[PDB]
A paper describes a structure:
Canonical members of the PADI family catalyse the post-translational conversion of peptidyl arginine residues to citrulline in a process known as citrullination. However, PADI6 does not yet have a confirmed catalytic function, with its classification as an arginine deiminase based on sequence conservation and genomic co-localisation with the other PADI family members. The molecular mechanisms surrounding the function of PADI6 are poorly understood, however a growing body of evidence supports a structural role for PADI6 in early embryo development.
Ca1 is coordinated in hPADI4 by two glutamic acid residues initially, followed by a glutamine residue upon Ca2 binding (E353, E411, Q349). These Ca1 binding glutamic acid residues are not conserved in hPADI6 where they are replaced by a alanine and methionine (A362, M420), rendering Ca1 binding highly unlikely. Only the asparagine is not conserved in hPADI6 where it is replaced by an alanine (A382). The aspartic acids (D359, D482) and histidine (H480) are conserved in hPADI6, and structurally align with the equivalent residues in the Ca2+-bound forms of hPADI2 and hPADI4. The catalytic cysteine of hPADIs 1 to 4 is not conserved in hPADI6 but is replaced by an alanine flanked by two cysteine residues. C675 is still far from the active site centre however and would need to move approximately 9.1 Å to be in a similar position to the catalytic cysteine of Ca2+-bound holo-hPADI4. By contrast, hPADI6 is well ordered in this region and a loop (E670–D673, blocking loop) blocks the entrance to the active site cleft, occupying the site bound by BAEE in substrate-bound hPADI4.
Residue numbers in the entry:
A (entry chain A): 7 to 63, 71 to 165, 177 to 382, 390 to 694
B (entry chain B): 8 to 63, 72 to 165, 179 to 694
Amino acid sequence: RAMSFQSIIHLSLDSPVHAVCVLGTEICLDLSGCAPQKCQCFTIHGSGRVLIDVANTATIWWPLSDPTYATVKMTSPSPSVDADKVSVTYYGPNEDAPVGTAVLYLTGIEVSLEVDIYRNGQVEMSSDKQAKKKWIWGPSGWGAILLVNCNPTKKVIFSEEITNLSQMTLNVQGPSCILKKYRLVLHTSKEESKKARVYWPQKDNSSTFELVLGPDQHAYTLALLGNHLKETFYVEAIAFPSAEFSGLISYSVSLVEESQDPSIPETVLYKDTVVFRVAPCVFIPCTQVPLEVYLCRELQLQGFVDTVTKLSEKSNSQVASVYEDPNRLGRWLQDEMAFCYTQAPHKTTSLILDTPQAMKYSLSPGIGYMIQDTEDHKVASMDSIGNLMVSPPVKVQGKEYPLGRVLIGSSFYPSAEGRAMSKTLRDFLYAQQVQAPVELYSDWLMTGHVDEFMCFIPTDDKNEGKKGFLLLLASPSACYKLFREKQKEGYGDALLFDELRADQLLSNGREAKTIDQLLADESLKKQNEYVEKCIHLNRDILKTELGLVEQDIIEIPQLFCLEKLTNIPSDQQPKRSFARPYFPDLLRMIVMGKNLGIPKPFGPQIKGTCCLEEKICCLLEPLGFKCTFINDFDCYLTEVGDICACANIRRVPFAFKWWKMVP
Amino acid sequence: AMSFQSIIHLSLDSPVHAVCVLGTEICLDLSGCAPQKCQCFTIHGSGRVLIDVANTTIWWPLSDPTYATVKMTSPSPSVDADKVSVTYYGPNEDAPVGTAVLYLTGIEVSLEVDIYRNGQVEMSSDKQAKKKWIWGPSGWGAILLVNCNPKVIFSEEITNLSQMTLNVQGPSCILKKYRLVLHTSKEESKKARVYWPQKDNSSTFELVLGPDQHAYTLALLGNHLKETFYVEAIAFPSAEFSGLISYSVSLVEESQDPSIPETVLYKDTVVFRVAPCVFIPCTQVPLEVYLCRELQLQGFVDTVTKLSEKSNSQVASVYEDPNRLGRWLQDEMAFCYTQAPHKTTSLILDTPQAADLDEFPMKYSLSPGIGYMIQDTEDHKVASMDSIGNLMVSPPVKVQGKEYPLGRVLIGSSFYPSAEGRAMSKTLRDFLYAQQVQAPVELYSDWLMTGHVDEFMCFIPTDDKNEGKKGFLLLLASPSACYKLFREKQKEGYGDALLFDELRADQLLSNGREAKTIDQLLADESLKKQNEYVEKCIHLNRDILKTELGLVEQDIIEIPQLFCLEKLTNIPSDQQPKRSFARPYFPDLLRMIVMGKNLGIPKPFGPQIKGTCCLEEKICCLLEPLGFKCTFINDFDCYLTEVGDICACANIRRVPFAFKWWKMVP
């Protein structure tokens, strides 16, 4: 018989050995095992396609130690059986006549599954048949990547725009009479198979593809017929990383020899394996350049819609009209949806991650869609993708976060009526690994949204090598100080909510008051002292987990007031009070480069000018920002569940490749 | 009062009053209240204040963003007991233009554990590094042991749990205003238990945190508060549990005013890692040989016991389990260990295949101090491979640099999606991979009836570690080697030598074997075709083992061994697989009991030459020169029993690795 597909071949003097070898495999030859006793040296010959590596511990005679091992490899497929050969000639002590000779006849067979492991936009061969089985993060790492299909049976037509999925090439090569003996099996674990789909084009250039592997088929058989098989398969991921799926999927090809005796089972001779990582879902901070501006113009194409639309024009950003959904709560375009992206070397896909807390959504061409499951569905439930803010890229005590860090609001401690993100959604976020999430304390808010006490704005200081962002933070203490400063100047008669109409103040549950009155409202100060404490707790957290300094923080005067949650049934109405903005929150701004669309506060007016608007411009306009105040008081004070003119902005995906990070 | 503020804004008109939690940095904006004319300042503080003027009689220059962080070293004795004064100066004016004052009160609120793994709780200077668990010799992070013992009172012998100390200090007029809340996430709470010894009787303990309590309130009254808590894990790492559990103490001030809610001022968090379940290879020294003597002490148990005494190892009798299939002690249980700096716990991991209703009684009374832990499984058939008996630990190895100081778990499975393939269930496989410290290796054993790799491979401990070598040897079955040996014997004229010579008629007939001469064996075409198939399977594993354990041919020794292919008949015929599986033809020489250099090898009853087995002679020629002392076990019935039938089995408890698992980098 032939010593085929064996890691070690025992050489023989009487008769030669014949073996069939899969390309890339190392065969160890025990040269000293069959060496006569007299021998003390040998000479080794080989054909061209054979690579001989003698181990440690013109004719060239090498010493025959005990043991003496030499590993043989085959570089290219054999053109015919036994078309390569190795000969070991043993020599006795001082005779010059060869004592004996051992002969090996090799046939080289190629069976390789190859993918784009070097992330150069093409399927590249991997010489290291062991390294191709690993997926390593970092600039020195490697590993093919797989994109989740974000487009909303046994055969499917994929057009050329969608055929930008990952590529996996199966190459089989060798003498026909050898290849005919075996069959191939492309397979993966059943768990893995339920996490991606493999399609095979039925004919070259055919838009028609057959699902060879998928959730219902973890094994696909291929018949070898002596030709030099060359087939490209197309894989697509079906789900982002999750708590039970690290994102790694392996595919293998196994060589099988059907049995010639029914009693004897069939035999397995070789297996090659490749690895894909499912690219994670990456969220984009507001410091990134705006590209599109989606507005849920809820029959209110004026005020917010008109000014926001104008703002995007100033910032060179497109506007897309979103259609209101009757089955969804108000402000669903931002509280229940988020712009994100998932990247691979061959294609970048931007999409909406939707977290229905309650299906018709029409995006600009090329923008994907994906639904993430939620568990809590309250009106003020903090278990929505809206309870999330992405910090700009930062560097905390060495460790880099080039894609920023997701920030999620929860209850700092197990409060009696605390609220927080569900396990399902939090687990989804933590599994992406590339924007290490940070827990913030926003349970004191009624909405739970951190955009009501903080907001990031882009600076061009990175030209000088600076951080390139600023953190704006609500500070009731700064507003009280400003109002007290105006009082010292004699402007205590100035009135908050001055240029506002009674049908708006009364419907929005606010009443106008002078600087002297607010600075005398004792309950209002106790409430704003409570909020000031909450904000400083988040200030200490943010400075820690984002590596911020006080030079990065700009306090913005902002007042709040504590009110019960009344937009839900009384049976589930929390007894405690939650914070709501007293006047339109200045930190809920629309950031578009240096153009800032800030909500108009309607603060006390001095010489016909809002003192809050004047102070905000004094703070930011010297930094190069263009404040543009949006006059819609009804929209900015709308209830938690009521309908408002919503807005959500698509932004440029990070230029940094997420796979070059080291989580 | 700017109590617990990250930044304090100074003022020349009035001083600031603040409470500072020990270990926290308060940033001071000196330039904010600096008079415009000023170009320099002087900063003084009290002994307990640490002032770090950091930014990009002594006068320091006053830059535009002049910032300084103040820290407190020890708790304040009384409110405002410590002060910092910044005096600002104008240009060419000896008179100080102004002064700002801050009053600091230092409060300690620290939750501390043994993060440096020296068996004692240690204060953590870095309040943010203690939240991290870092692997490796330069890492840190406290460790937790699972409870493997088969209000609550716990004796001192069982009081070897992990310790978590809570310390609070500071003036009482301040502490009395707040309360503590020791808590953990709801999910984490369901992974461990925290007990607090009552101040009355130390032997009695109260469950402050557990699977039904993720928050526990303590009222802060006195100047000083110190309480020690004892933590135990309840389950090893799994697919739904990385092994990290954190506990935090939050400082809460109650709100007298009904309209305003309570306020959170500070939180200290510590992190524990649950120590994984580590399996031991047979190259480690034996301590106890457990034997399930199924009402038969003649061949197997009698020999094993004598080998155990010869090897300086105790012997422990195992009560036979009437509700479990035979060989359960070997096939359904494994001796593991979980290690912590304070304590190492050896235990038995049982994967009961015997059924979902395998019931109320677990008749295993191990030696004192030996734990017990059940791992659930999915497949419970007779020839199933979904059990901890389908597991072999490799010796410590190095593969392309990456080290495996605890060895590598090896699991049998179907290499490819066979038509009737078998493997470990997801549940068991996930449990094993979750341990991370013995990174599993998938091997091909679906071709054997039992699925056990012990029937084709065995590790034996060499003492060449004194010579800086690997310290083990890999014995591998070789049907080809056995044929070559038999052919040599035929060539010498011994073709008449008879396999199974010294065995009686009742033995062969009951164990389904027929004596044959060497001439007959070498003639049996089906036997050659059956062992050629087994040769192909083993050679595939040989490549896997060399790659994933960094082995060379010098590490491998071929042991002559023959097999045969048979249909699984020990089960109902309606569930009988169509295919054939390999079984040892004559007693498997590799299913040996390894105790140091004393090797208990099954007696093969091979062809005899001059009244001596040639298989025993070959085995001794191979291994005795390497220092091993072979001792053949004569029990033909035991080593040829069917899959489900009763056997005299053994399971040896061995020394846990010396290497501390937490010092490796998976």
